[PDB]
Design an enzyme around this catalytic site. Structure first.
Site, mmCIF file in Angstrom:
data_model
loop_
_atom_site.group_PDB
_atom_site.id
_atom_site.type_symbol
_atom_site.label_atom_id
_atom_site.label_comp_id
_atom_site.label_asym_id
_atom_site.label_seq_id
_atom_site.Cartn_x
_atom_site.Cartn_y
_atom_site.Cartn_z
ATOM 1 N N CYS A 60 35.946 42.715 41.461
ATOM 2 C CA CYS A 60 36.815 41.541 41.128
ATOM 3 C C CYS A 60 36.748 40.505 42.259
ATOM 4 O O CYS A 60 36.149 40.811 43.310
ATOM 5 C CB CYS A 60 38.258 41.976 40.892
ATOM 6 N N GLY A 91 40.038 45.760 43.660
ATOM 7 C CA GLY A 91 39.821 47.121 44.187
ATOM 8 C C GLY A 91 40.068 48.194 43.143
ATOM 9 O O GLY A 91 40.118 47.860 41.941
ATOM 10 N N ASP A 103 45.368 50.471 36.496
ATOM 11 C CA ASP A 103 45.858 50.744 37.874
ATOM 12 C C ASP A 103 46.591 49.501 38.399
ATOM 13 O O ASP A 103 47.541 49.668 39.186
ATOM 14 C CB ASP A 103 44.718 51.191 38.799
ATOM 15 N N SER A 122 28.277 55.420 46.362
ATOM 16 C CA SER A 122 27.416 55.363 47.573
ATOM 17 C C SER A 122 28.020 56.251 48.664
ATOM 18 O O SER A 122 29.257 56.408 48.670
ATOM 19 C CB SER A 122 27.266 53.941 48.051
#
Length: 576
Positions: A1, A77, A101, A356
């Site tokens: 975002c 996030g 969320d 990652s």
């Protein structure tokens, strides 16, 4: 975002949508799915959205009406404990219209105020405007995975995920002072200074409040020195438990999710643990590589993808334009920036989310500068002792500019501030102290630059990168573990390897292109690049065989070509 916005107690921001749009839409890349605006007298919040959890419901900026007026948030996030927190909030009497969320964090603020920062677990760059107190709150995650910048105005504040958001405002001139250039020509060191004059970078694990009284900053989390009671066996067991828990929680998404397999113990550990947890939904893991990588793919039984990059593709000037545009600054790391851009661009064609293992080396003392005594006992940043000597392009700068930088004094001053911040337990021996310092500087300077790199590049193509290792609990724990245990196998990441023993199973042409692109640049000597770099020394360096050029000159070329591009796209005003 992509979060942006503007607060003022001097101007009416009710009908400044076109300006807010200019700030927000500059980061259309960060969130290509949707965009939103919320405007009021004193506050204007914009949002660019990459939909990962709840597409129709998680619309931003999200607003919750209270008796005292609206509470609007712009959020970038992933809160991984949003289910747990929603259950806690339901018991306290909160009703939820969405399964996002986003609402949990916003109703979380309704409950605990700014202290929501201390209850969230994951990555976030949050901008909350509370009309009840006419007060802005800016929250950045503990490790610094998601970026946030801010810029003071007369009785007001401008903020955004990327500098381009603030720069897009018509009352902000693109100015870079000498303190700016020093950070720009710095080498993998964190600073509040965002290169752009009067523009700052939010410190990880802090909450900035802003109202009529001014700007306030509070540190809700930082690494602490605590006694480590757990023995080697328990310490190895606990690391697995934490890495596993993190992986499991971060696999949650309403969109296709992938993995980044480089073959290293870091990526292979995340891939093996993720494969086991994705199997729990019959989900065939999707790995992506830019030798040991292909082996681990067959072990997990994943839908592997071998992304092939030619020197031609890495050298493409159009790539360097995209890379510098995303970064907003000429860092001159084209090789390791363009590589992961094309990597994430290929990954985006298949998946919207990617995991990652980036922070692993920084938390598990992996790098050679973690291991080398010379580096740990040096009077500067460990990674300067090991690499800078080669990468230093200061020979290829105009003496006038080089003498004006004073990079040695800057690096020394910044290192003094950095070692001062390092918390030690009392009565610790030299080995244990120099280890802490090594790990602290790694996590609060080096890891921050990588995080922002991984973010900028990934968000430039609209890919959400997740970092299971880049966790505050896992960082806090491993910081207090004695050096003895971290290298108990007589190798780097011994606690990582011992925890992931079951799942894991054991160019010259590019430089020629840089020289040709530099010769093109030298053809036009009017370029403001040659106010910083010596024209004569570049020509000399460009004239050499690609095989002869190595280290400092290579770094000089990548810097000069980035600077050339930078000067055209952003048009800064260097106060030099």
């Amino acid at each position: 975002c992509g979060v942006a916005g503007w607060v003022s107690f001097r101007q009416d921001l009710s009908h400044e949508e076109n300006i807010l749009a200019g700030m927000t839409n500059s980061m259309t890349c960060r969130g290509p799915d949707a965009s939103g605006q919320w405007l009021s007298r004193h506050a204007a919040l914009g949002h660019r959205r990459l939909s990962i959890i709840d597409l129709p419901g998680g619309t931003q900026p999200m607003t919750v009406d209270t008796p005292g007026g609206p509470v609007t948030m712009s959020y970038s996030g992933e809160t991984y404990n949003f289910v747990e927190l929603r259950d806690e909030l339901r018991k306290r009497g909160h009703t939820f219209r969405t399964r996002s969320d986003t609402e949990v964090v916003l109703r979380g603020y309704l409950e605990w105020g700014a202290a929501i920062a201390e209850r969230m677990v994951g990555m976030c760059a949050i901008a909350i405007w509370d009309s009840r107190y006419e007060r802005l709150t800016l929250i950045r995650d503990r490790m610094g995975t998601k970026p946030m910048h801010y810029y003071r105005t007369k009785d007001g504040l401008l903020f955004g995920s990327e500098p381009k958001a603030i720069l897009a405002h018509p009352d902000v001139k693109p100015v870079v002072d000498m303190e700016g250039m020093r950070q720009l020509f710095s080498f993998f060191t964190s600073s509040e200074n965002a290169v752009w004059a009067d523009m700052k970078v939010m410190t990880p694990g802090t909450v900035i409040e802003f109202d009529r009284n001014g700007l306030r900053e509070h540190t809700y989390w930082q690494l602490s020195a605590e006694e480590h009671t757990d023995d080697l066996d328990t310490t190895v067991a606990r690391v697995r438990q934490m890495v596993e828990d993190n992986v499991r929680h971060e696999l949650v998404a309403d969109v296709p999710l992938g993995l980044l397999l480089s073959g290293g113990l870091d990526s292979s550990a995340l891939a093996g643990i993720a494969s086991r947890h994705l199997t729990a939904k019959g989900e065939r893991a999707r790995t992506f590589s830019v030798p040991y990588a292909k082996e681990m793919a067959a072990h997990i039984g994943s839908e592997h993808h071998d992304i092939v990059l030619d020197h031609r593709r890495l050298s493409d000037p159009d790539l360097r334009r995209s890379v510098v545009a995303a970064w907003d600054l000429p860092w001159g790391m084209g090789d390791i920036n363009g590589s992961m851009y094309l990597l994430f661009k290929a990954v985006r064609e298949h998946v919207t989310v990617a995991l990652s293992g980036e922070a692993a080396d920084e938390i598990f003392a992996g790098h050679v500068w973690h291991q080398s005594k010379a580096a740990r006992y040096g009077g500067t940043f460990p990674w300067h002792t090991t690499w800078l000597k080669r990468v230093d392009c200061s020979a290829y700068l105009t003496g006038e500019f080089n003498a004006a930088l004073d990079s040695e004094t800057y690096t020394a001053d910044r290192f003094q501030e950095a070692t001062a911040r390092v918390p030690y337990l009392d009565g610790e021996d030299e080995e244990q102290r120099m280890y802490r310092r090594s790990l602290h500087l790694g996590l609060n300077h080096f890891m921050r630059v990588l995080e922002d790199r991984v973010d900028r590049m990934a968000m430039a193509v609209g890919l959400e990168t997740r970092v299971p290792f880049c966790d505050y609990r896992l960082a806090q724990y491993l910081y207090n573990v004695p050096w003895t245990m971290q290298t108990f196998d007589g190798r780097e990441k011994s606690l990582l390897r011992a925890s992931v023993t079951d799942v894991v199973t054991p160019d010259t042409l590019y430089v020629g292109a840089l020289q040709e692109q530099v010769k093109i640049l030298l053809k036009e000597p009017s370029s403001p690049v040659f106010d910083l770099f010596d024209r004569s020394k570049l020509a000399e360096a460009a004239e050499l065989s690609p095989q002869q050029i190595a280290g400092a000159p290579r770094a000089a070329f990548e810097k000069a070509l980035d600077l050339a591009v930078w000067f055209e796209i952003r048009n800064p005003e260097l106060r030099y």
